[PDB]
Design a protein around this ligand. Structure first.
Ligand code: CL
Ligand code: CL
Ligand code: MG
Length: 467
């Protein structure tokens, strides 16, 4: 428009708009050397005339301590001048000051008054603030319906936080009936904007086919975008996609790197998967006991029951007497959380008196818990517990039933052989009873096998009436 000298002439003539603009020339330092003293002087001259935008600007300068000592209380006074005259940005900032108790005592109801005025003028930050207020019940009574309405207005204008909130609410059924498809649409808007959490959530939805068609390639790309921004969950989820070759060839070395990124942030899942790669190895990844133990221990300490079970198992396979005791303590923690492998491992520890005093009655209890969760190895051991009467009264019918369950479950060879051996011990009626019992156990405690069997079983025909 006009240069500095021409602008100066207008400002000195008393034009408030020119005074504010001149202030900004000094503030920004583009056409003239940055000079906060001169910037403030001209900002103040414009505000002297009650020029609303300049009053708002002094609010910013006092709020931020730019060219003046930071002073929230004074910022509030300036914002209120401009807010009372309807300037949306001043209303929003004043609302924030009240919400935070910056320069004024916290007043959540008052914050909502100001957010509402800014929101009614269509500012997306105000609309978001109203959404958050109704979502939190902060200065207003909680109302997820109202929250959704305000978030929608903000999200339509590109407000990313509001997109994520809508994604969340539609996923959880807050103020609206759960709809995974609509949830995914909102998270997609977020993800396309470059948002780490929108990418994370949409990736997870493509992984499991929630609200969208299952698609590991889309999942990989979205997890990658979120992981590159540092998200520890996205990092291990991407790692798993890569290790398992779900969207490409298996890439175990690349998986390792992503698991390590996750693990180093303290993510117990990342720590688990990193440890698991060192535990089991993969193509190009050597087994490493020390690393497996170290990373399982961090994961286990964070309550990961899979890590607890696997750490104990490493110690049981190869460990000192103290390591066996530690293993039992880990199995105990994981068994308490319901991890079937830990219940099984604890059961066997108690049968042997390995790392713990031998206790066959307690062994049978843990073994049954594991067997009921479908672990065929536990079904075999529980069968032998009944066969030999270890912490239970000997019962060949129960033995046969658990062995047949294990055999049918996942073609456990020891189940099959033990069943065949036990059968000779049974009368014809005991065998009938054991077969019925195994049918019950298979349906309840090997349900995947039950379903497979039911779909394949020979069925009888029915004769239709004729003539
Ligand atoms: Cl703006
Ligand atoms: Cl695993
Ligand atoms: Mg709040």
């Amino acid at each position: 428009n006009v240069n500095l000298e021409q602008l100066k002439q207008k400002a000195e003539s008393g034009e408030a708009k020119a005074q504010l603009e001149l202030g900004y020339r000094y503030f920004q330092g583009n056409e003239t050397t940055k000079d906060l003293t001169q910037a403030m002087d001209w900002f103040r001259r414009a505000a002297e005339q009650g020029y609303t935008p300049a009053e708002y600007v002094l609010g910013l300068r006092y709020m931020n301590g730019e060219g003046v000592p930071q002073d929230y209380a004074q910022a509030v006074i300036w914002y209120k001048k401009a807010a009372l005259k309807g300037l949306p940005q001043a209303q929003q900032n004043l609302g924030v000051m009240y919400h935070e108790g910056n320069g004024v005592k916290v007043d959540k109801a008052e914050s909502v008054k100001w957010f509402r005025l800014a929101a009614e003028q269509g500012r997306d930050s105000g609309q978001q603030s109203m959404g958050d207020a109704y979502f939190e019940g902060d200065g207003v009574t909680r109302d997820y319906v109202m929250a959704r309405e305000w978030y929608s207005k903000a999200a339509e204008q590109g407000n990313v936080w509001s997109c994520n909130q809508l994604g969340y609410m539609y996923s959880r059924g807050l103020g609206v009936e759960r709809n995974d498809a609509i949830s995914a649409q909102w998270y997609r808007k977020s993800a396309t904007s470059g948002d780490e959490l929108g990418q994370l959530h949409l990736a997870d939805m493509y992984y499991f086919g929630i609200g969208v068609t299952q698609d590991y390639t889309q999942s990989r790309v979205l997890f990658s975008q979120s992981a590159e921004q540092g998200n520890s969950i996205a990092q291990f989820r991407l790692g798993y996609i890569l290790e398992q070759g779900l969207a490409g060839a298996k890439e175990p070395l690349k998986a390792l790197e992503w698991y390590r990124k996750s693990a180093e942030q303290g993510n117990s899942d990342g720590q688990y998967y990193l440890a698991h790669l060192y535990d089991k190895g993969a193509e190009g990844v050597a087994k490493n006991r020390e690393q497996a133990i170290s990373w399982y221990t961090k994961s286990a300490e964070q309550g990961d029951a899979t890590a607890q079970a696997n750490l104990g198992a490493i110690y049981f396979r190869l460990g000192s007497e103290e390591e066996h005791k530690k293993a039992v303590e880990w199995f105990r923690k994981a068994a308490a959380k319901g991890e079937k492998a830990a219940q099984f491992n604890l059961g066997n520890a108690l049968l042997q008196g390995k790392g713990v005093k031998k206790d066959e009655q307690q062994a049978a209890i843990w073994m049954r818990k594991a067997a009921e969760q479908g672990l065929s190895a536990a079904q075999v051991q529980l069968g032998e517990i009944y066969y030999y009467g270890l912490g239970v009264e000997r019962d060949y019918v129960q033995a046969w039933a658990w062995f047949d369950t294990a055999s049918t479950n996942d073609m456990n060879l020891f189940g099959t052989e033990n069943r065949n051996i036990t059968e000779k011990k049974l009368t014809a009626k005991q065998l009938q009873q054991a077969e019925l019992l195994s049918q019950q156990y298979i349906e309840k405690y090997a349900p995947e096998a039950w379903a497979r069997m039911q779909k394949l079983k020979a069925q009888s025909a029915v004769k239709t009436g004729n003539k």
